[PDB]
Design an enzyme around this catalytic site. Structure first.
Site, short mmCIF file in Angstrom:
data_model
loop_
_atom_site.label_atom_id
_atom_site.label_comp_id
_atom_site.label_asym_id
_atom_site.label_seq_id
_atom_site.Cartn_x
_atom_site.Cartn_y
_atom_site.Cartn_z
N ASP A 1 53.18 8.91 -28.58
CA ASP A 1 53.83 8.69 -29.87
C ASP A 1 52.97 7.82 -30.78
OD1 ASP A 1 55.55 8.30 -31.93
OD2 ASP A 1 56.94 6.97 -30.84
N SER B 1 48.25 11.90 -48.50
CA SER B 1 47.91 13.29 -48.75
C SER B 1 47.69 13.50 -50.25
CB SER B 1 49.03 14.20 -48.24
OG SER B 1 48.85 15.55 -48.62
#
Length: 330
Positions: free
Chosen positions: A35, A199
């Site tokens: 994770d 992004s």
């Protein structure tokens, strides 16, 4: 040194991925959920409340000659999906794919929430975010990666998750045969303890690319892609009959649909998520309403590039002094 381990979807939907991890001496092999959005290595154990164990493999520290109680240390964690676990702490030898760390904090669960009990395939979590998020008190502990880093050939690990197929976690090297083209690297902020990056935009299907900054985290422990409501609405508007259902808890779509792809930007590069990756199947057995793999992050407080996004790429988690993230197509 290096390590290389195969990671395997837990079910036919790729809800999560498990990777075998050797703990203790002799080795006890547990299948852990790696994770990159948390920083605790915790396991089902001989100390876990019996009624909360249902099919998991447990770690028994009394059977390990290298286990030592970390005296006075406790831990307690809550995840974004509302699940939680807590307990005490041992140090022991932990190996992943041939890479060994001695003295790793292994957090033994005394209590786990129902979602963990109900998932027989996940024996615990191995956190790979920054150690500043580790929950051990009163002495915070380091992640497996942080402990291994100095010994690694290069201070990196890579995630290469499969779509409905196994993939690979590598430590200490970049497998140049595992991706196509070049890797585009992008800046990371560690201010919140995550692999947080920005992004450069998105496209829906064959549509034009929208340049827009989207701050979010690369999180292998989250199944879906959670993005701003504007972006998500633009995606689902291209699917006839798709709608947000408050009763179901997100966007659903007719199972008869063909889903468009979704592209996200990494610098000037583009990662394309095929439409099929966005299908999470019937909301309930036999339903013709299917659950979407792109959902709104509104009210999470952060955008999450979970498995839906990451499995479309070869992803480099670069833990150099100034960390960065790299993405390549594959």
């Amino acid at each position: 040194s290096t390590g290389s381990a195969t990671t395997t979807p837990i079910d036919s939907l790729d809800d999560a991925y498990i990777t075998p991890v050797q703990i203790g001496t002799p080795a006890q092999t547990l299948n852990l959920d790696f994770d990159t959005g948390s920083s605790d290595l915790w396991v089902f154990s001989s100390e876990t409340t019996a009624s909360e164990v249902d099919g998991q493999t447990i770690y028994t520290p009394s059977k390990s000659t290298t286990a030592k109680l970390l005296s006075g240390a406790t831990w307690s964690i809550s995840y974004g999906d509302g699940s939680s676990s807590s307990g005490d702490v041992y140090t022991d030898t932990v190996s992943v794919g041939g890479l060994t760390v001695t003295g790793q904090a292994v957090e033994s669960a005394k209590k786990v929430s129902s979602s963990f009990t109900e998932d027989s395939t996940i024996d615990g979590l191995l956190g790979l975010a920054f150690s500043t998020l580790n929950t051990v008190s009163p002495t915070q502990q380091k992640t497996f990666f942080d402990n291994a880093k100095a010994s690694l050939d290069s201070p990196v690990f890579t995630a290469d998750l499969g779509y409905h197929a196994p993939g690979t976690y590598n430590f200490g090297f970049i497998d140049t045969t595992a991706y196509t083209g070049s890797i585009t690297y992008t800046a990371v902020s560690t201010k919140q303890g995550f692999w947080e990056w920005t992004s450069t935009g998105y496209a829906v299907g064959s549509g034009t690319f929208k340049s827009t900054s989207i701050d979010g985290i690369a999180d292998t422990g989250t199944t879906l892609l959670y993005l701003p409501a504007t972006v998500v609405s633009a995606y689902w508007a291209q699917v006839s009959g798709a709608k947000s259902s408050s009763s179901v808890g997100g966007y659903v779509f007719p199972c008869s649909a063909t889903l468009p792809s979704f592209t996200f930007g990494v610098g000037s590069a583009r990662i394309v998520i095929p439409g099929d990756y966005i299908d999470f199947g019937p909301i309930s057995t036999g339903s013709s309403s299917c659950f979407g793999g792109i959902q709104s992050s509104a009210g999470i407080g952060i955008n999450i590039f979970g498995d839906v996004a990451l499995k479309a790429a070869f992803v480099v988690f670069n833990g150099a002094t100034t960390p960065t993230l790299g993405f390549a197509s594959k």
